[PDB]
């Protein structure tokens, strides 16, 4: 017998103790080695309610990634008040590694195995696991990168789609690569990301079709963000320790969703950033020399739907919704912690 409970989880990973890469370093002291003998047990005739939007595992992951970033990033200067803090800022080795979250004695993680589970409500096929799968703590906005894919159809996740204040997480069933590079050796901050537009627009078409299922049949249209800091009006991510900000206007092209080869998004590597962890600005050193390149899988999209639209027969979605916790939610949605009684 068990019931929904929160408890402090621990983490596990395949971190190498000799690595310099900062996630490895962190995990070497914060986590144990990945479960050498993972056991997943199918719970017969058990239906369980899940709610990815109220899941303390998300809170705990957020706390760990904040801690990882706090101890790993080395900004030349950190601005918070009031307080200007200067320090050495050598370039670091930065490449997220998968982290597993595991329950301590007397608790277990239930896992939802329903192929098209949207993140809330009953799950009919439930198993128990000692640890989650390995989740890379990729911090990004607009586009979810390097995550898992939905098994079957594209899934729309939201605590309530009719509620425009709730972020929408689109879970792709096919990834689309995004290939970002700051070429070797003008302007060393200028970069760009290349996306195969043919593949992208196809997927985006499929996304609009799933959204259409949830919204009557309304015309689904994408628009650029209505406002916000650069971290949320651009697709923001960290590649090789450098902070990229890429303009995604071309990625949400309604004309090509109603016509493309390669889409190249203009990016900038920024030294002056707003920190995701806690309010405050940071300044980093100029980009490292050489070819800087990250090829990532787009595995999900965060969206916000325009409110007030009862005149129109359309629904309008803009990239961006929510906060970095939703990145973890996008991977933790299928899990919940339960206490054994």
């Amino acid at each position, epitope marked *: 017998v068990w019931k929904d409970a929160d408890t402090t989880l621990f983490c596990a990973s395949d971190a190498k103790a000799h690595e310099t890469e900062v996630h490895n370093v962190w995990a070497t002291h914060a986590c144990v080695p990945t479960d050498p003998n993972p056991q997943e047990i199918h719970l017969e005739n058990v239906t369980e309610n899940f709610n990815m939007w109220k899941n303390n595992m998300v809170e705990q992951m957020q706390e760990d990634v904040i801690s990882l970033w706090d101890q790993s990033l080395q900004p030349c200067v950190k601005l918070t008040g009031g307080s200007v803090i200067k320090q050495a800022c050598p370039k670091i080795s930065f490449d997220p590694i998968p982290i597993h979250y595991c329950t301590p004695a007397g608790y277990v993680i239930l896992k939802c195995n329903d192929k098209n589970f949207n993140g809330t409500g009953p799950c009919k096929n439930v198993s128990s696991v000692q640890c989650t799968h390995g989740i890379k703590p990729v911090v990004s906005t607009q586009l979810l990168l390097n995550g898992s894919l939905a098994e079957e159809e594209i899934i729309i996740r939201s605590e309530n789609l009719t509620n425009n204040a709730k972020t929408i997480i689109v879970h792709l069933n096919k990834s689309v690569e995004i290939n970002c590079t700051r070429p070797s050796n003008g302007d060393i901050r200028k970069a760009y990301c290349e996306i195969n537009g043919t593949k992208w627009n196809k997927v985006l078409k499929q996304v609009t079709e799933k959204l259409k299922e949830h919204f009557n049949n309304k015309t689904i249209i994408f628009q650029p963000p209505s406002g916000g800091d650069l*971290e949320i009006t651009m697709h923001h991510f960290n590649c090789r320790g450098e902070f990229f900000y890429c303009n995604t206007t071309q990625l949400f092209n309604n004309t090509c969703i109603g016509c493309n080869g390669t889409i190249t998004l203009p990016c900038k590597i920024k030294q002056i950033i707003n920190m995701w962890q806690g309010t405050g600005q940071a300044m980093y050193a100029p980009p490292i020399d050489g070819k800087i390149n990250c090829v990532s899988n787009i595995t999900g999209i965060l969206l916000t739907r325009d409110g007030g639209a009862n005149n129109t027969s359309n629904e309008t979605f803009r990239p961006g919704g929510g906060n970095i916790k939703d990145n973890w939610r996008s991977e933790l949605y299928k899990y919940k912690v339960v206490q054994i009684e």
Partner: antibody, heavy 125, light 100 residues
């Protein structure tokens, strides 16, 4: 005690811009959206949008896009409503409002238990 | 989205005011009271829950898409315009006229 403190009435010529502040206190500003609602004669109460202090994400109905900007000053826990190119029919009492339920991990935006006192903006030649 | 009725209610203290809001869409329904020259005040949320400090003579109920706010034992200070709300949308308001 949650408090939403609005700035004072304003008078504007048509074509001008206005800016109204809503200084919040009594809770963690970051944790939930701020909303603006205007009370314009003949038009009851009309929601103008929300703004999340984290990142300053916003959501505006289409009719206000291009003229409304909702912004914040994180250092003073203050939200702002800016509206440009004012016209006569922008004359209204402007309220900021916040949901009843707001925690570090969850909120429900729309049960507006908390309202600023309102800011009259009259737009007139 | 939200249709209120009647437009105006003109009642004496001690009487019962029955305010209707008809919805066309999904979502939690709230009622507000707005007295003249004052901010609106939340009265009911989630169709039937009473907001902080709202006297118990205010009650919200729901029948299918039809929501009602009943104000029993009306008082002069109940004068005002009452709005129903669902997410960002507000009804057009029902004016309750009551005085000493």
């Amino acid at each position: 005690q949650v408090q939403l403190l609005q700035s004072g009435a304003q008078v504007k010529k048509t074509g001008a811009s206005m800016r109204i502040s809503c200084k919040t206190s009594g809770y963690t500003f970051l944790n939930c959206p701020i909303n603006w609602v205007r009370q314009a004669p003949g038009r009851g109460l009309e929601w103008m949008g929300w703004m999340k202090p984290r990142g300053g994400a916003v959501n505006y109905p289409q009719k206000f896009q291009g003229r409304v900007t909702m912004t914040r000053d994180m250092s003073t826990d203050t939200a702002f409503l800016d509206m440009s190119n004012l016209r006569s029919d922008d004359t209204a009492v402007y309220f900021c409002a916040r949901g009843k339920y707001c925690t570090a991990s969850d909120y429900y935006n729309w049960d507006f238990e908390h309202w600023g006192r309102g800011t009259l903006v009259t737009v007139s030649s | 989205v939200l249709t209120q009725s009647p437009g105006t209610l003109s009642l004496s203290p001690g009487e019962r005011a029955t305010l209707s809001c008809r919805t066309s869409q999904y979502g939690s329904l709230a009622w507000y009271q707005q007295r003249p020259g004052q901010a609106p005040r939340l009265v009911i949320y989630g169709g039937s829950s009473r907001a902080t400090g709202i006297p118990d003579r205010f009650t919200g109920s729901r029948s299918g898409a039809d929501y009602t706010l009943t104000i029993n034992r009306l008082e002069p200070e109940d004068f005002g315009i009452y709005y129903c709300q669902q997410y960002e949308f507000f009804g057009q308001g029902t004016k309750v006229e009551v005085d000493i």
